[PDB]
Amino acid sequence: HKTFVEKYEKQIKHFGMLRRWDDSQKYLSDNVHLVCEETANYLVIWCIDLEVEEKCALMEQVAHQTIVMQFILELAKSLKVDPRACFRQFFTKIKTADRQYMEGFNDELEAFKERVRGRAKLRIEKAMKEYEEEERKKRLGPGGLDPVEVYESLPEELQKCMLQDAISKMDPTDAKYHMQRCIDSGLWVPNSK
Amino acid sequence: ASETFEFQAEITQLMSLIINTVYSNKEIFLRELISNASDALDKIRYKSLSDPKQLETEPDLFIRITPKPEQKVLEIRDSGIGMTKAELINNLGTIAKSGTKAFMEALSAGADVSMIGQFGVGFYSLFLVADRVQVISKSNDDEQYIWESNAGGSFTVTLDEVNERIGRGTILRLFLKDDQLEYLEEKRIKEVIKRHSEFVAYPIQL
All structural domains of chain A, each given as residue ranges with its CATH number in brackets, are 1-140 (1.20.58.610), 141-186 (6.10.140.250)
Q: Do B109 and A20 lie within an 8 Å CB cutoff?
A: no
Strand order in the sheet with B73-78: B3-6, B154-159, B144-149, B130-138, B169-176, B73-78, B63-68, B204-205
* Residues B148 and B137 sit within 8 Å (Cβ to Cβ): no
Is A11 an 8 Å CB contact of chain B? no
- Picking from A13, A18, A20, the nearest residue to B109 by CB comes out as A13
Which of B6, B5, B9, B10 has its CA nearest to residue B120? B10
Query: Any idea what the Cα angle at residue A23 is, between residues A20 and A27, rounded to 5°?
Result: 140
Backbone angles phi, psi at B52, to 5 degrees: -60, -20
- Picking from A18, A55, A57, the nearest residue to B118 by CB comes out as A18
* Residues B72 and B175 sit within 8 Å (Cβ to Cβ): yes
Q: How far is CA A158 from the centre of its chain?
A: 41
- Picking from B105, B117, B120, the nearest residue to A55 by CB comes out as B105
* Residues B174 and B133 sit within 8 Å (Cβ to Cβ): yes
Looking at the DSSP bridge assignments, the partners of residue B159 are B145
Which of A38, A70, A52 has its CA nearest to residue A118? A52
- Chain B residues inside the 8 Å CB shell of A18: 115, 118
- Chain A residues inside the 8 Å CB shell of B117: 20
The CA–CA distances, whole Å, from B133 to A147, B79, B100 equal 66, 18, 18
Question: Within 10 A of A172 (CB to CB), how many other CB atoms are there?
Answer: 7
* d(CA B179, nearest CA chain A) in Å: 30
Residues 19-48 of A with CB under 8 A from B: 19-20, 22-23
Distance CA B56, CA B96 (A): 30
Is A10 an 8 Å CB contact of chain B? yes
| Minimal-distance CA residue of chain A relative to B116 | A18
Distance CA B122, CA A170 (A): 81
First-to-final CA distance of chain A: 62
Looking at the DSSP bridge assignments, the partners of residue B134 are B148, B173
| Minimal-distance CA residue of chain A relative to B104 | A58
Q: Do A58 and B105 lie within an 8 Å CB cutoff?
A: yes
Looking at the DSSP bridge assignments, the partners of residue B4 are B156
* Residues B125 and B38 sit within 8 Å (Cβ to Cβ): no
Coil vs helix vs strand at B171: strand
Is A17 an 8 Å CB contact of chain B? yes
Is A57 an 8 Å CB contact of chain B? yes
Dihedral angle sign, alpha carbons of residues A56, A57, A60, A65:
negative
b/e code A25-45 from CB counts within 10 Å (16+ = b): beebeeeeebbbeebbbbbbe
Question: Within 10 A of B54 (CB to CB), how many other CB atoms are there?
Answer: 18
Query: Any idea what the Cα angle at residue A107 is, between residues A102 and A111, rounded to 5°?
Result: 145
| DSSP 8-state assignment for residue B102 | H
Distance CA B154, CA A96 (A): 40
Which of B143, B141, B148, B166 has its CA nearest to residue B77? B166
Axis-axis angle for helices A56-79, A87-95 (nearest 10):
110
Resolution for the entry shown, Å: 2.3
Which of B73, B81, B78, B65 has its CA nearest to residue B205? B65
Please state how this structure was obtained: X-ray
- Chain B residues inside the 8 Å CB shell of A20: 117-118
Distance CA A155, CA B87 (A): 68
Distance CA A78, CA A81 (A): 8
Return the H-helix or E-strand segment holding A29: helix A21-29
Residues 6+ apart with CB under 8 A from B5: B89, B93, B154, B155, B156, B157
Tell me the count of A-B CB pairs closer than 8 A. 38
Q: Which residue pairs from A64-72 have beta carbons closer than 8 angstroms and sit at least 24 positions apart in sequence?
A: A64/A19, A64/A109, A65/A15, A65/A16, A65/A17, A65/A18, A65/A19, A65/A24, A66/A16, A66/A40, A66/A112, A67/A105, A67/A108, A67/A109, A67/A112, A68/A24, A69/A15, A69/A35, A69/A39, A69/A40, A69/A43, A70/A40, A71/A105, A72/A35
User: Which residues of B lie closer than 8 Å to A, measured between beta carbons?
Assistant: 98-99, 101-102, 105-106, 109-111, 115, 117-120, 199
For an interface test with A, give the residue of B10, B116, B118 to mutate (most A CBs within 10 A): B118
* d(CA B94, nearest CA chain A) in Å: 15
| Domains along the sequence of chain B with CATH | 1-206 (3.30.565.10)
Tell me how many helices (H) and strands (E) chain B has: 6, 8
Residue B125, Ramachandran bin (φ over 0: left; ψ between -120 and 50: alpha; else beta): alpha
Tell me how many helices (H) and strands (E) chain A has: 9, 0
Return the H-helix or E-strand segment holding B134: strand B130-138
* Residues B58 and B17 sit within 8 Å (Cβ to Cβ): no
Question: Within 10 A of A119 (CB to CB), how many other CB atoms are there?
Answer: 16
Looking at the DSSP bridge assignments, the partners of residue B130 are B176
Residues 6+ apart with CB under 8 A from A167: none
Which of B77, B86, B83 has its CA nearest to residue B140? B83
Dihedral angle sign, alpha carbons of residues B32, B35, B37, B39:
negative
Q: How far is CA B62 from the centre of its chain?
A: 15
* Residues B198 and B74 sit within 8 Å (Cβ to Cβ): no
Q: Do A17 and B106 lie within an 8 Å CB cutoff?
A: yes
* Residues B151 and B64 sit within 8 Å (Cβ to Cβ): no
